Design a protein around this ligand. Structure first.
Ligand code: THG
Ligand code: THG
Ligand code: NDU
Ligand code: NDU
Lengths: 264, 264
């Protein structure tokens, strides 16, 4: 997509060298923002083929509050394999915090349920937020949340979402992250009888891994294509009742997929 | 400042009329980002006279972990009066979350010390975060945190910080927010023997109150003056040991103050 490729090019051009957690090294910038008007099309990158399969199942998995990879495996999704323990557990990552954020008194908070009720009852609220950044549970997580903090907003019958992504693997992660949140906006909009607005993406440490440079030059050599259209085929009873088969992407015409190794 | 006036004009150009919690009404956009290179000068609005004294005392108050207005009153700062209970308490707002985030297992995390040690020991970490958005304690707070989530970054010996401000009263709040975080970057940088980088400001619901419009137009008619310069006179042994008289602002030549009512 134009803004995605612009970001890639910017990291290449302006990023500074970082030694990082993984020992791989990156080129990195700090602070970026992009805006995707979801009525212009579904923001699935077209300069490499992205598999919506993994994106969809990961999102449904988050929504069901699951942090064990068994569900993902049932659906042939292997994207979380490198960080799961012997029992397939990741600890209290994304899903757990979205659906069951724990408090010291032993209670749990369902942020997604809160958000739906906020959108339906108080759409003008400036407090329609989900955080995965549960400081007190970081030490138990396989990875600290990358897509850490997000907000919804409603105007003129349209639902927008902004994500604060503290850490972004521009090549591997970002295409997924953008599509995932765009999908979520479509789902919540449907449940709330709203139209879709913008997805606003904000990055913190926004980087290209040193071992993704060939892949980056290959992708940058490619021109984007018009965005596909998301079709939701069935409206379920609640935001927690979607299934993979509910979603179709029409008019997705990508360039070929590009393979690159993940930094562990 | 140019960035600040440009934001005001962006709200005017793109914003939509929204009802709000306070019953005042706003003109609102969703999603913005701007940058202040702190080496250019200290980003205190010059197109109206701002009260650095309140800004400084508020930040020292946060850093102490305090959430009661007594200290503010002792220093003739009244900016939190409208939300405090009969005993002066705001509940577990910023200060508390910054210094003593409660974990589910009964620990407390001092996020400010955590970040200081991360910057000293592992500045290329992508996890150098402070969150005030403690989902389990929101209900106890007089207001939900506006300046909600922030991240530090280091490159070429310079400390940067990005704030995600979920809700922004552009006329009243934002000048304070920008100056407060800029001060914090300087303090943090001092403690870490770093130079200052950028403060990156990102907004969620970014708005002008209905009853700030006269004031906004007036301010927009004015040319920014040179940025003032911040001089820190002392290096305390701890980030929690700064005093009011450690800070001086030099060369601040603002246009006249502009009064406006706060929405409760
Ligand atoms: N450093 C590092 N980078 C990352 C993650 C990490 O934790 N570490 N986690 C992220 C979470 N998202 C993804 C997205 C895609 C893949 C992936 O590997 N994708 C393949 C193959 C897709 C598939 O499995 O079918 C591709 O070429 O697009 C891995 C993590 C992305 N980047
Ligand atoms: N709706 C609204 N509510 C708020 C804030 C806001 O931003 N807008 N911010 C709060 C904390 N910060 C401030 C910052 C500035 C002011 C303010 O009122 N400032 C005046 C008067 C300052 C003074 O006391 O001298 C000014 O002219 O700058 C009040 C609360 C709490 N609630
Ligand atoms: C992390 C990620 N995730 O773990 O789910 C995601 O959704 N997107 C990412 O881009 N992502 C990246 C950022 C970074 O390259 C690593 C995480 O490492 P740390 O920043 O060191 O935690 O994965
Ligand atoms: C809130 C605020 N604070 O309460 O500390 C701050 O520091 N900056 C603000 O701009 N600020 C504003 C945003 C909004 O106009 C109100 C808070 O109201 P809600 O968004 O309804 O919670 O204060």
């Amino acid at each position: 997509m134009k803004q995605y490729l612009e970001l890639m090019q910017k990291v290449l051009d302006e990023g500074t060298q970082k030694n990082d957690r993984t020992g791989t090294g990156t080129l990195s910038i700090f602070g970026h923002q992009m805006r995707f008007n979801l009525q212009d099309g579904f923001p699935l990158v077209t300069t490499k083929r992205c598999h919506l399969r993994s994106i969809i199942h990961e999102l449904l998995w988050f929504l069901q509050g699951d942090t064990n990879i068994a569900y993902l495996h049932e659906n042939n999704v292997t994207i979380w394999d490198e960080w799961a323990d012997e029992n397939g557990d990741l600890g209290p990552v994304y899903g757990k915090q979205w659906r069951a954020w724990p408090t010291p008194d032993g209670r749990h908070i369902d942020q997604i349920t809160t958000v739906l009720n906020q959108l339906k009852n108080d759409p003008d609220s400036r407090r329609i937020i989900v955080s995965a950044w549960n400081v007190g549970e970081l030490d138990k997580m396989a990875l600290a949340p990358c897509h850490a903090f997000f907000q919804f907003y409603v105007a003129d019958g349209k639902l927008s979402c902004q994500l604060y992504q503290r850490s972004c693997d521009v090549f591997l992660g970002l295409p997924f992250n953008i599509a995932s949140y765009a999908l979520l906006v479509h789902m919540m909009a449907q449940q709330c009888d709203l139209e879709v607005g913008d997805f606003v993406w904000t990055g913190g440490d926004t980087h290209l891994y040193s071992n993704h440079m060939d892949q980056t030059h290959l992708q940058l050599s490619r021109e984007p294509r018009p965005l596909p259209k998301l079709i939701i085929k069935r409206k379920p009873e609640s935001i927690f009742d979607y299934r993979f088969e509910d979603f179709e992407i029409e008019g997705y015409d990508p360039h070929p997929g590009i393979k690159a190794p993940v930094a562990i």
